[PDB]
Symmetry: D2
Subunit: 317 residues, 4 copies
């Protein structure tokens, strides 16, 4: 039988992700949402598009978790977003309400598709993937969060733009927690293996512009929201998560910064945070421990501790 991909949450990101799954014939799709008839509407739109693409993909809409039975992969966008930010929204609403949805999603995964590879997108990302892992009981290797691939896609793009080379040939990474305490890694940026500093010396780019690109990367999500007025980014967020899903389903063994369960690496135990990892047919297969400078480890430590604060505040109740 085909691979089964279930999208928990059928908003903008969920629909586009399902569009990519249909365009790439990655497998049968299931769009789930609490809103009645809505996932069923997109599914029929998307079903019609398969006709234009000359594919066979089955896309289904549903308001019941039962239809995620046997899913090979599960990708979760459901919950409140950051669009309101009201400075008390993250603390009084985002964190406490989303944690409760993650617990309900995790329980449904546990009963209906406990073998799936599970990719979380809901924010606060690092916190929510932990909660989803706890509630679902699945191996820590098969539950991770999408954040670094998106933050890296922005980083790489901004670099590629100034240098005027294809983004394929810009290697860039962003680690740490997803959010304002993310850590772009300017030292590790290369152009097809060439350190970026070589282009600084040859005048393709300058050091300040690089520092600007670091900050623009950290705020890229808000830059787009502000410009949209209504809504948030969904084209790149959806591709990033489907890159990770394609890496799992085709055992591509790609190297991508993802939010994953550490156990000693980087001096972190029993915690989810963004790090470079190898994604393969068996999920998160290897964590790469980068030889970070002391300064870099400091930014990583301050970012890893904000994640703790919130994991603990959530554990209060």
């Amino acid at each position: 039988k085909r691979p089964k991909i279930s999208l928990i949450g059928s908003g903008m990101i969920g629909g586009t992700m399902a569009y990519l799954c249909a365009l790439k014939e990655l497998g049968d799709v299931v769009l789930f949402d609490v809103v009645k008839n809505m996932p069923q509407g997109k599914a029929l739109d998307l079903s019609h598009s398969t006709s234009v693409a000359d594919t066979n993909v089955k896309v289904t809409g549903t308001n019941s978790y039962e239809d995620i039975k046997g899913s090979d992969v599960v990708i979760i966008t459901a919950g409140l977003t950051k669009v309101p930010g009201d400075k008390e929204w993250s603390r009084d609403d985002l964190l406490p309400i989303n944690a409760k949805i993650m617990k309900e999603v995790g329980e449904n995964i546990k009963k209906y598709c406990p073998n799936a590879f599970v990719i979380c997108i809901t924010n606060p990302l690092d916190v929510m993937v932990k909660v989803l892992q706890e509630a679902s009981g699945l191996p820590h290797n098969k539950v991770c969060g999408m954040a670094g691939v998106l933050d890296s896609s922005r980083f790489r793009y901004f670099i590629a733009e100034k240098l005027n080379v294809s983004p394929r040939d810009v290697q860039a990474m962003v680690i740490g927690a997803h959010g304002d305490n993310m850590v772009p890694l300017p030292r590790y940026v290369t152009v097809n293996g060439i350190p970026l500093q070589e282009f600084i010396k040859k005048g393709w780019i300058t050091q300040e512009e690089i520092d600007e690109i670091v900050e623009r990367t950290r705020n890229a999500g808000g830059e787009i929201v502000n410009l949209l007025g209504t809504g948030s980014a969904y084209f790149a967020p959806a591709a990033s998560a489907i890159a990770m899903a394609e890496a799992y389903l085709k055992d591509q063994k790609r190297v991508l910064p993802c939010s994953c369960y550490l156990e000693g690496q980087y001096g972190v135990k029993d915690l989810y945070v963004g790090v470079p990892v190898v994604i393969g047919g068996n999920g998160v297969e290897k964590v790469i421990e980068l030889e970070l400078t002391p300064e870099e480890k400091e930014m990583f430590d301050k970012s890893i501790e904000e994640v703790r604060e919130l994991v603990k505040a959530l554990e209060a109740l």
Copy 2:
């Protein structure tokens, strides 16, 4: 120079089309919209997504018509969804004007409704060759027809040929007589038990109403995934000179009994636009449905010319 694709209108359809242009590396994408900043917001999102796809596509958003200069393809969703007819026409008039000033060699694909009517306003206002302007509707209506037939037979939509002609709307005309499975007449599958004559009739009316069917289930807005894909397939056919056979709203000069009118019929789309009109051997009944389908189009086109 890369091909340049300008999307006049950056709503749901326009943005979805821009994404397909970026995934398929069809060319540089310009997202135009009257709304301030919003196109630029989507453009940056889309730009980011090129890193994930490892492409080099340039996607820019703008609020100034000047940025469509030199466009090889223009795709128009600008409009709204009882003042809608004349307001959409002033828009379509304005869009068509900027096209002639800025990119008078573009292949233009109108999407806004009433499609077949607004197509002719656009051509008149832009003064472009009649074969370089057309409307996307038949590809989408056929993809629904094709899809519904495919799922009942349990074969791939690729091997279902099905077409829809006439005007885009509730009176569109699916053609069950021409449906085939890899060229095998659909009727052969009635006789061998794959589908019944009643289910075909039911499917034919579900195709007529699919637009509203989707609208009722979404609750806010209308379909756009298949709409976007249909427009891009038409643009891909022009950019790569694929000579595809597709139902599109095109300028007829006597074919089917229509003069100086844009109406949905099968055409060959290639590097020089709408390169050939296919004139089907329609039966009297089928020709009758076609005539009643376009009646509304011929009236509206006359009424709008009066209001100039």
Copy 3:
């Protein structure tokens, strides 16, 4: 684990098929041949190409059947070709020698990958697929021959060329035995569902040109050989067979003329011959019984009987 595709025979067709499998990331490939080191050379060439395509595909060369263990799909080009044609080659060499290789291939499939979907290309095609089925003991649904997709690709192309429309939008089919007694179906040719006769009346094509295209289709293989001097077609033959393999592995349910096991359909029992079929995740899933004219059934009967003659001559010894 990835899907495993084994190519029995690593000649021109076998290598190209493996190139397509690598380009399309359809799965892990195994190139097998009796020639020592040769399949291993192509595999390393192809391995290098995956670097240019930015894929992860594992391509392996081998001279041992043991390495086809667990194959999801098996595609067989091995044996003598038609390139010599010496009028006694088909009878004294092609048929008797290839049948013996098919029996050895079938036995190796039976012991090492009895769950595979098996696509035969060796000629005489309809005869050899039967022999391979007998020797391997696998379900008749999971063993078929590639012939009609190639003969149809030629038919469709010749039509598309004269009309000057994309071949995608020309539906054309060829049924019967692969070879000189193949049956192009001019009546069933459509342009996106439109009968071809409509274009005859409107002057895009004429009836004689159509009849020429029927004959050119029947001789297309020899036309190319003659022009090549050395060798035979391998680009289209390889794609055709990989289309059938992609249809199985992705459960695409495509409609394609293939050589398959009939049991009453078309008044043929216990025999392999080319007919329109639906290929899906479970192999050959449905045979389509076309409402052929009496004339058409006559050409089909004369083509189905030449296949018998050879199946019986082979059964002598």
Copy 4:
């Protein structure tokens, strides 16, 4: 008009390249060869294969140079594998002449060996801009280097960056110092136990010799799958203006200490050909290997100019 890709030489590499052009719908393909009928035979085979891929690509074979008129890209494999140097040069002279007559705006990618030497003969004989002529070698040598490194680490080749510069041959110069895993220096993976310093050295010499390694195993002929893919990736970079960073044999005017010579170095390939040369910060040892690598090229280029 579709892009026009002419392949001067229809052997194994040339035909494999034509197939990739047809699969990727990059443009119309012209297969030229001196051998009578053989190109036409492959063209018809390839044409048939377009039906299976559902593309509209035109593939023609010919024995007359006139059919390359207007080519946007030309890719040259014409040659043979102790008279081979001067015979290949008369050929490369002849090919370059017909190019200037027939398609003097083409992007030209030479493949025949000794690559870096025959590249300069071609440019001289064709009189084309030095940025519109280059040679494919570094992409292939890097794809082997990249591949060997990828399989030992068990990561995707996509996330291995590795380069090879200098001349194409046994003296080519892999650059283990610049190898990275998604930008992470390869040395970090020594320290954490993924690969050893000895296996890198071994890999670096296996890259040098991969060409012959393949040749020994095939028994007849040489590699062509990766060779073809590398040339097409370079042509795709030109046709779609992808601005790819790739090691190619390109005209240097003082970079690296080379004047009026074609040598393998990293470049940016885009819509205007070889748009930029990247000048790496090579160490003394690395610069030394580079100089010894091109010594043979500078001598042969001088010796062949004398024989005119």
